[PDB]
Structure formats: C-alpha cells, structure tokens
C-alpha cells in the first residue's frame, strides 16, 4: 500500500528530527497525529502533501 509507505517515510523523517534535536516531541506528536489521520482516511495524496510538508522540514531545519 502506498500509503502505509508514505507514513512509515514520514515517521522515519520525523523520528530522525527529533532525535537530532531540531524538533519538538510535541511537534512530532502533532504531525504523528496528522499521519494517524492520513492513515484512517486512505488518500494517497493527502499522506504524501504531509510528508512534503515534513520533508520540507527536514530541508528548512539541516
């Protein structure tokens, strides 16, 4: 499923910042939330807007 892929990038992403010190644990909750949320609901396209919203992060952040 494309979708379970996306997340699981997503998460990787995420949990990288975080451990890295360049995010907050609640930042991370949120967008762990909102990923939860993409999960449910199953649009493909959805999921990925958050994780080019994560990836941005990540390239705004490093």
């Given at each position: 499923?494309?979708?379970?892929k996306?997340?699981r990038?997503?998460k990787?992403?995420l949990?990288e910042?975080?451990?890295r010190?360049?995010?907050?644990?609640?930042?991370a909750?949120i967008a762990?939330?909102?990923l939860?949320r993409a999960?449910?609901?199953?649009?493909?396209?959805?999921?990925r807007?958050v994780?080019?919203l994560?990836?941005?992060?990540?390239?705004e952040?490093?």
């Amino acid at each position: 499923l494309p979708v379970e892929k996306i997340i699981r990038e997503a998460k990787k992403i995420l949990d990288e910042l975080l451990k890295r010190g360049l995010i907050d644990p609640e930042l991370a909750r949120i967008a762990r939330e909102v990923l939860e949320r993409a999960r449910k609901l199953g649009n493909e396209e959805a999921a990925r807007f958050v994780l080019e919203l994560i990836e941005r992060l990540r390239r705004e952040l490093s």
